[model samples]
Target: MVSSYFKGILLNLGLDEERIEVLENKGGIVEDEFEGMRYLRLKDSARSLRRGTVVFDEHNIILGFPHIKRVVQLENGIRRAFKRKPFYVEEKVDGYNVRVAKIGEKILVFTRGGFVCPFTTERIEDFITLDFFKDYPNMVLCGEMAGPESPYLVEGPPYVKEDIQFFLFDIQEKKTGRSLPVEERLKLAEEYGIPSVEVFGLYDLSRIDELHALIDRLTKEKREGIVMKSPDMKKIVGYVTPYANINDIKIGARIFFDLPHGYFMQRIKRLAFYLAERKIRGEEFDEYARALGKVLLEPFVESIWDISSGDDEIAELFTVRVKKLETAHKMVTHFERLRLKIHIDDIEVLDNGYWRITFKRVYPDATKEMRELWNGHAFV
Candidate 1:
């Protein structure tokens, strides 16, 4: 068995404790070379183990991708080393790695390692997005969701409320092992109303020296880091993570959904306080919240402007408030306009370096001028 092959390599290498620990977690093949430890990650997630032919060195550690670094060789009757070429770097997101698949009318979700995620599975019909599902027969959306804990959850010059943002990066055509271009893949995700993986740029190794700004930007925003990838290479050789699996690299996409970085809406009103890290009890925080809350409450509650609660209320909110979700924020302009209502109830402090607020939930809702506070979706 391949497991036997690994055991033999381990024995040959005489790699004591530290190497074994990582091997135990990864369940992959090991080889002891004169240079260093060489490993091949095995995909032992219920299914048969996939070979870790793909390499994920320290420079890049994509989830479930292998970490193959070098191949030993000999030339002119002399033994030497030949390093792997054309590798990519991707930023890792600390959240559930989801696999989205479509079978006929059904779009399914499985964890990256192949475990089915029921929570998202149930919402499939309602959340069936991405027009590519129709075009490619059955396309999968390999994505990650960043929660509030992410530093970059709030983004932009004017901070925004933190919300879970979905970024779909990989478009694996299971049948052919081929992947679509980044731009085309993103289009498919958007066409179906499905969320984008938020992969912004494909970095060619030439910019490695200049990657400083990207690295700094991500760290400053509390994001992980930027992924370096070759836009020229399309097909992803998988066997990564715990197995040295290296596909394309993924960077931070959270900035797009929740906030510009560590702040709230781009609107200047929210920006000032976020920069200050104002807490719920902070005087400035309070003043700014109420000022914005006033606008948040909007004019009318319940749909139809006068319809009783239930479907009627939701309908009106949908028709009016939701339209704002379509428009880009006017960060600076709105902040100056809404700064008076900062003391509203939505802003609450949480444990750790974290802060909580209702602003995110009531996004399109609060975009309007309101009479009083109204519970937005799910909060009521």
Candidate 2:
């Protein structure tokens, strides 16, 4: 039996009782016995949604479009669970995942969930005039529509001054349903004078620490984070969230309806399974499992900086570096010579009087320890 919430959603979408019965009886998707006779059922009322989303059909037409590929969930930690082979890192563009297809001279835009978006054509008309897409009539360009003037969502890169701009990310062939590789897609984007997602670099999994540092820098710049992908474009893909981000605002606004269950339920299941496995492995899991909520919520809450919802301030615990001491090198050598205990980042002297001294601790304590160690010393 479908829940009341499910029925209400269907009714809101204009699905009649008879249609609801057919829809509910269909379970989820019901493909056709044949091409002409085929009628693939929608998972729910969202199948034909027109506002803020795009819908496309089997022929790649913007008619109740479906067949969205499932996004993979990486295992365990953010940096874990990947081969040692090289992979690409891309900026996680914050916007709606919309697809634009050129069926001859006609250009149709579909939302991530595959709904027709008429406004996208108006917003992206300049792209249609690019002429490069004219040669590939059988191409589907997937990109993001973001910036201040974005009709759908009202947020984007701080660097972008335009009201709205379409940034291409992937190219798909209409006939084969195969997508071009990331490198080839970038080349195609360049050839067509189209902008694609920012590519950080190709990296090996061994450089996880450097990748973590990169995320730190991105967070400092208030970016959404990065998506890691294999060159093949399908084999492997992952994501790493920065220490600080405002994704809650974007995620709350859009409902994807793709996860198997509620976030809390999924968390419970994950913890329960992990504990159960650890129990049989002769390992202690009670304390760590109990702390899961804190372990997750603290980081998540600290990461957010939602400007739209009065959440303007982003705060976190961090180490600070202090420099510019007149006798930094001499002081550092004296401290080392005396064998005084201290946490030091580095002490370097540039050409002339230019010099720097660093500490591992924050605030007055970093300098406080040094003063207390040597009374009336020149180090202070």
Candidate 3:
């Protein structure tokens, strides 16, 4: 059995302890308890920490699971390293699983175990409603937010310039104790006009292969991994393969401070998969024009530093457009040089209000001339 100290760490991480009652130590984990089994974890109590095992962060919301549970099988009675997931799987992220109750404008954010969290008090206050939930008043919304940049849900936001969005996934109304089907619940969320995490369709075990492809796509993007749901159980019985608590972070990564992998992981994964599968990585995707730097519209001004070389008034009237595309679109290019795809995605104009010019798309690979132009000027 895992020591109580180990258990304490999980509570610190943020799991709703009262919801899940641990019966044994961390041996093997019980996948579900639909039959009133209480979700067993490890039949025995003597399992070692590293015996073909993986541990969830201390504050995991899924109840009845021990911190250090074995994922692999015993070899001659010794534990061995098992694959992260049994079949095709997805990346498991760590964050606060939020359960939002919507009654028109009133939405309540709660832990997965059903207790409301006040930290998100303002989040719903300034809420975004989806058109699907227009008629439903007693429904709920479920999602996980990597809350900006705070991995593992530390005290605040991460250091990255991340955003928190509602990815509608689940919906249900108490209607005097009659819970609707998952699809109905989702439609309700959509009718209400809130963005939700409902892109992944009805999920199941046999669909792990599709999930595998999804994992391949997400890993390259800014996402952490996937979350699998059951068809009949209407509850978040378990996460897909390679389940992780993301548990809570304690360091530096995003902007202003910390963020959580709440409703953003899947979204980021889809974003990154677009780039990774297409062979794009960082700043290369952003498009910039140089003529505007010379305000006079002279084509000779190379970098910002070279503007003064020509007429002095050139920089005054010239405004080059440098934008980072935020439009949710994905593009793929063959990076034959490296056997990859260049995914041009979520394109946005980053200059905001600084520059003034027509516009330019950074097609660095279309031609060596384009690449040279991207870095500085078009080259033959």
Candidate 4:
């Protein structure tokens, strides 16, 4: 049964009680309790809303960041998708997505999946000032939290060397959840001393070759691709470099058997499209093929060898720093809720009065299966 508070919130969002009931029954909308607040998260799109939209019991709604469609074949995809309309190209940082907002008296950091991330909440002040939120209390700062120190992502943008940093990309009105125009967002971000994603200027269908050249440059630099957006913030699409695809495979290969079949297949397909579209022939193709083979086999074989050599478990390790020890505890609790088997390896005090926490995310499926196979178990 739908609660009265949820029904009221959904009604305020223009969703009738009947539709709410249907969404609830269909598992499209789920009730999530975070830090004493009860909210409804749209696991799937409801009506015109996108997935990941969150509605607080107090009637404050956060519209989900819409999925930017991917274009494997850049020139034709962008031309047809944008209909020859001019669009702005911006760097797509490889990191976790977050929406920071000032709620009542406290500032909260929400993940893409609509959960309040304690670690980000604790560290947000280190990246940007809160004065912008004070001035625009009804606005949401959408950005990526990226660096090697992140607990969520195994890989981060190459530019951010050590600690995490926030890069403002979009600003949306809290009440209506409407994104500001790209120019206005950039202006506000700059005026407020916020770090934002790099904008590669505007382009039209006529500049397809230039766009390809830009992507080529990014690929050589080993950077992620770009996101093309229409001025109004309505139309959006993205493309990634071949390096990003291979890097993803490299990192995920350790838990190869546990990952979805599509995880490997999709990236390979994207690389194939990228190579063909870019006309990477002869020696260039051979280099990429060699790199791909190494990434796919090296880490996976190492994992198997380690298991056979008597390693107890195979886990992805990460080190993160937080101002307070309690924040690390809260982060562990949050990971626990996500069913991630976390093992705290070490905790040390840093010179800057921060607590550096190192932990591992144990992959049980891969570890168990590998152990069984190494113990002489035979498959049918």
* Among all candidates shown, the one with the greatest lDDT: 4
Query: Which residue pairs show backbone clashes in model 4?
Result: none
Predictions in order: lDDT: 0.37, 0.50, 0.34, 0.86
TM-score of each: 0.38, 0.51, 0.35, 0.94
Runs off by more than 4 Å, candidate 4: 16-19, 22-28, 57-59, 376-380
Q: Over the stretch 153-263, how does candidate 2's per-residue lDDT look in tens digits?
A: 435666666445677767776634467788988888878777788899898767867876776577567666676666877644534332222333223222212223564
Q: How many backbone overlaps does candidate 2 show?
A: 9
Off by over 4 Å in 2: 1-81, 127-129, 240-380
Top TM-score hit: 4
Ranking of candidates on lDDT, top first? 4, 2, 1, 3
lDDT for 337 in candidate 1 is 37
Query: Cα miss at 278, model 3 (Å)?
Result: 23
lDDT of 4 by residue, 256-315 (tens): 887876998888999999899888899999999998999999999999988898867888
- Model 1 gets an lDDT of 0.37
Ten residues in a row with the worst lDDT in model 1? 242-251
Q: Which of 1 and 3 is ahead in TM-score?
A: 1
Count of clashing residue pairs in every prediction: 69, 9, 77, 0
Q: Better model by TM-score, 1 or 4? A: 4
